């Protein structure tokens, strides 16, 4: 079994701050798997920050940024989409359990 907790959330922030998360992730040999469904994921989330209050947590895999699939996308490009968005970001993530 793979228990999936999917959420799609909107982050809104001032310029004096970040969204409050570390994004990590990778080649071309990645094949999406229930255990590991995406390339980029959240390494940590600032508990006192914006991405935490919206429900993002350590270990969330990033599925969609601002409406676009980023399952197979590389770190620099995903970071770019996120940076284009400015002070708002719509992201879809999944948490995998068991």
């Amino acid at each position: 079994d793979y228990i999936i907790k999917e959420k799609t959330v909107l982050l809104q922030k001032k310029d004096s701050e970040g969204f409050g998360f570390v994004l990590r992730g990778a080649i071309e040999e990645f094949t999406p798997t229930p255990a590991f469904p995406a390339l980029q994921y959240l390494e940590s989330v600032d508990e006192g920050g914006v991405a935490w209050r919206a429900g993002l947590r350590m270990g969330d895999f990033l599925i969609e940024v601002n409406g676009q699939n980023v399952v197979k996308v590389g770190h620099r490009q995903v970071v770019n989409m996120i940076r284009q968005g400015g002070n708002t970001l719509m992201v879809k993530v999944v948490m995998v359990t068991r």
Binding site: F19, F21, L23, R24, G25, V79
Partner: peptide, 5 residues
């Protein structure tokens, strides 16, 4: 890679 956002 890693990036604080």
């Amino acid at each position: 890679d890693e990036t604080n956002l």
